[PDB]
From a paper:
In this study, we present a crystal structure of polκ containing amino acids (aa) 1–526 in complex with template-primer and an incoming nucleotide at 2.0 Å resolution. We co-crystallized polκ (aa 1–526) with DNA containing a T base at the template position and a correct incoming nucleotide dAMPNPP (dATP*). The ternary complex diffracted to 2.0-Å resolution at the synchrotron and contains two ternary complexes (Mol A and Mol B) in the asymmetric unit. The final model of Mol A consists of polκ residues 16–224 and 282–518, DNA substrates (primer-template), an incoming dATP* and two Mg2+ ions. However, Mol B has a more flexible N-clasp domain than that of Mol A and was traced to residue 20 only. The well-ordered N-terminal residues (16–26 aa) interact with the αN1 and αN2 helices of the N-clasp, as well as finger and thumb domains, contributing to the stability of the overall structure of polκ. The N-terminal fragment also covers the DNA’s major groove and contacts the template base and incoming nucleotide in the active site. Interestingly, Lys25 in the present structure interacts with the oxygen atoms of α- and γ-phosphates of the incoming nucleotide through hydrogen bonds. Other newly observed interactions in this structure are water-mediated H-bonds between Arg18 and the template base dT and between Arg149 and the base of the incoming dATP*. The ordering of the N-clasp domain brings conserved lysine residues to contact with the replicating basepair in the active site and facilitates nucleotidyl transfer, while the internal flexibility allows DNA translocation and new incoming nucleotide binding for the next run of nucleotide incorporation.
Author numbering:
A (entry chain A): 16 to 224, 282 to 518
B (entry chain B): 20 to 224, 282 to 518
The structure:
Amino acid sequence: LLRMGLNDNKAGMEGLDKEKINKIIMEATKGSRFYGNELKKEKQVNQRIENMMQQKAQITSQQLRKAQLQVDRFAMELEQSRNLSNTIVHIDMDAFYAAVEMRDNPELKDKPIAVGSMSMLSTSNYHARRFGVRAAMPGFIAKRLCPQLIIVPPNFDKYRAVSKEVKEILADYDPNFMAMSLDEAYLNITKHLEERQNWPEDKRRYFIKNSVVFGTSAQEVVKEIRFRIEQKTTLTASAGIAPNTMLAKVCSDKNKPNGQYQILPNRQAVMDFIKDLPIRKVSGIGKVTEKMLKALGIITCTELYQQRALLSLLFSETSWHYFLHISLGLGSTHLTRDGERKSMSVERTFSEINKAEEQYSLCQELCSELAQDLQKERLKGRTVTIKLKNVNFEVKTRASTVSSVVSTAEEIFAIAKELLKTEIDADFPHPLRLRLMGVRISSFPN
Amino acid sequence: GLNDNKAGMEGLDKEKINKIIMEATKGSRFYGNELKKEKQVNQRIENMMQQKAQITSQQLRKAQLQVDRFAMELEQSRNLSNTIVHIDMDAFYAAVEMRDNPELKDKPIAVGSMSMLSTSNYHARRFGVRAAMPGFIAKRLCPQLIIVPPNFDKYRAVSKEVKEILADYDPNFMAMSLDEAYLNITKHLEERQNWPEDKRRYFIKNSVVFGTSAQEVVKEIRFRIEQKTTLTASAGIAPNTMLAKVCSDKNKPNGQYQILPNRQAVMDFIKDLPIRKVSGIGKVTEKMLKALGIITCTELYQQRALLSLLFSETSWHYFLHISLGLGSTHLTRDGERKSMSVERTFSEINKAEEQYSLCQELCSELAQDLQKERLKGRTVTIKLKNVNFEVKTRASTVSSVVSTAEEIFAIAKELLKTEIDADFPHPLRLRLMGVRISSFPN
DNA sequence: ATACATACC
DNA sequence: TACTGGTATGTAT
DNA sequence: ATACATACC
DNA sequence: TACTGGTATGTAT
Ligand SMILES: Nc1ncnc2c1ncn2[C@H]1C[C@H](O)[C@@H](COP(=O)(O)NP(=O)(O)OP(=O)(O)O)O1
Ligand SMILES: Nc1ncnc2c1ncn2[C@H]1C[C@H](O)[C@@H](COP(=O)(O)NP(=O)(O)OP(=O)(O)O)O1
Ligand SMILES: [Cl-]
Ligand SMILES: [Cl-]
Ligand SMILES: [Cl-]
Ligand SMILES: [Cl-]
Ligand SMILES: [Cl-]
Ligand SMILES: [Cl-]
Ligand SMILES: [Cl-]
Ligand SMILES: [Cl-]
Ligand SMILES: [Cl-]
Ligand SMILES: [K+]
Ligand SMILES: [K+]
Ligand SMILES: [K+]
Ligand SMILES: [K+]
Ligand SMILES: [Mg+2]
Ligand SMILES: [Mg+2]
Ligand SMILES: [Mg+2]
Ligand SMILES: [Mg+2]
């Protein structure tokens, strides 16, 4: 089914008829170049699954036994270090962009809406999700699913502004909170909770926009956070409260929209939560990882744990280590400060460009935008990468690393232009037929 | 209603079109503000007509002599020695999109969004669809209309390809926008008289050879543009820029027109020319002059004395140049810019903290634009449009120049603060904000 | 170091 | 008519 | 120097 | 559902 076939792994999308919805998507997508490319990618994934299953058939009882012991040794060390003492909160705005648009055009409140264009949606409101409409779906497809759908263009500066208002509230509870995008954040409220236990009602009191008082527990802190967000912005958030970031993230989606959920911070509660948790609900387990694990009979975190020996023989160390943490209900119990960025990039999609001189011009423009962006943070990098996507949706990237760092439109373009030239020359006399180009700079000195 | 002063919009059922536009527009906030602006123009027309009725024979006679004196100097210096070309791409953005998606060449299309179109192709223009009209209205006029989102970087790239051709014929050509330019081909015509066929042969992408006349040069330019970019241009040839621009529109699209450089050809062209065809005569000026019985450049000349009493010096000087078929005969290099701005429309913002943040973001973009050209300025102006489409601008000027996001924002935020305080306790209900910097050291 | 894929919002 | 854009990282070479 | 209006693409 | 954005300059205070 790939990308196109409805992805219901999002809040507010339970109980839909994927057979009926996918017939509509397929009718709207039939014969397109996008579809052609999706079939190619699906066949790739299936080959990868086949290679894993062939490797699996070679595994013997002896090997599995040995892996089992080595994995259980590592699990014992993870288990002994389990930290249940931090209160991690994940805050996540409800239908963020759509909610802002509905707030400011209340005629939209009772309608199914989405934000974006006929080419692409960035989100949808909860009414629209009941028709299968969602982020990453083209608007023209969404309209087939929901003829009455209102598609609203984005107002990115508004969303940055709302986000600033939210973050100012969040800073009160964890001044080192980790903002992930505009609409979500992790907080460690451990310290705050400790101080809060001796705060008089005056420091936990808010007037409505007659006053209200919030208690001293974690659930009360998060009710206070949500209340302040709603009062300041007129928008709701959901929240998860858990002993680590992995669990808190799963929890914040659970009672969406306008809800919250806490896993009590005792081991038994964690394990009972994780027990029948579908792995697709955990951050980092995407469509492909899900498909590969499903081939092994793995759908839930219990199954993930049960097959840990096998996973240690079929997946890299970074992957089976990650799976084992999930399967034990472990994750980060402290938040790290936003580090040095490793890359910066710009890319753009367009109607077909096939003339070499126009491709060079496009490349130069992208190099200039990217130089402007680097200038803002005074960064310089040693590696320039171009990205080309042809009209059949096939992506290539072509990188070059240089001895001395670069920053200016001129320097970036002198590298990118050569990378592009090499591609134009390779297909000659056939023009490159492009729908997207991008330029990325990386290898900043650390 | 339908502003039909464009190529391809001749002989439309404007009755039907204006009904559809009007059903789509009446009752809106937009329409409310249009009525207010139309009333202000009508008031301005009424003030003028009441002034006109007080003008004496003696006043008219004194004006007439001053204007005739000024017209003598203008006529004396009439310069017919330069061949000025105006090049203008046909349906520019739409043509680019049709070029690169074959399914579109036989359909009505427009470029932009459901909120706003930047242009339309000639098929769509037959339904009254055009630039400056919202796509949602265009779709009522033309259900089958294809609205293509813009690809601005492609248009810039095509413009570069076009400008490279134009530099062969006049290296000091003046680019006016992405799709249009003025060239002075006088020098090139001198050189070209003695050029062998080798220097005037271009192959189709079979050879083609072009002659030595101005018309043949412009054919050669238009042929080259179509071979390089796959798009057509129209062109106007004339002794000055004012006339050249009129001519480029005359046989649009994919056409060409010349006014030969003799006084008589200029006057026969100008004679029954509707004034609205001249660049700088917009809707408002046209309506005011129509109120005086002025539709053509002939009528504009005749009422020159009256024009000098009813209009500022700048305006009647300008009208007089037009009525004599005069204009620029040498093209200046693009001088120092006078300002830089950014503005943006959004769904309603009414919370003061959000308004400050938008102002901040706008100030950063603007500092970024300035940093690119290393410019600093002393005047910062904010622009606020409310949900009833009313525009306010508020400026402040400082001693020493500024350029950083912080400096620009320090000034802008106090201007915004003043507007928020003046309406308190009612919030400002905005649909647009902008920031502009000006007063560069020149 | 480079190419391509996966994942997230 | 029309299938996004920015950053990090995993996998494989 | 400031505010608002017109014009162009 | 939905009426643009950038620059210059004219009109009036
Ligand atoms: N594929 C995508 N492409 C572009 N923008 C996207 C996107 N996915 C999301 N965004 C933008 C638009 C989103 O509004 C915003 C936050 O992402 P979420 O928190 O994942 N989604 P939301 O808040 O809408 O709904 P809820 O949390 O209740 O499920 O990021
Ligand atoms: N009101 C507007 N708003 C935004 N962009 C606009 C615009 N009007 C035009 N443009 C953009 C899009 C336009 O394509 C481009 C050139 O403007 P023209 O030469 O005045 N119009 P075209 O070339 O389309 O048609 P033809 O010359 O055959 O009459 O500028
Ligand atoms: Cl889809
Ligand atoms: Cl098919
Ligand atoms: Cl739409
Ligand atoms: Cl915005
Ligand atoms: Cl390619
Ligand atoms: Cl209109
Ligand atoms: Cl559309
Ligand atoms: Cl360019
Ligand atoms: Cl230009
Ligand atoms: K191709
Ligand atoms: K208002
Ligand atoms: K206002
Ligand atoms: K498509
Ligand atoms: Mg969200
Ligand atoms: Mg989120
Ligand atoms: Mg044009
Ligand atoms: Mg033009």
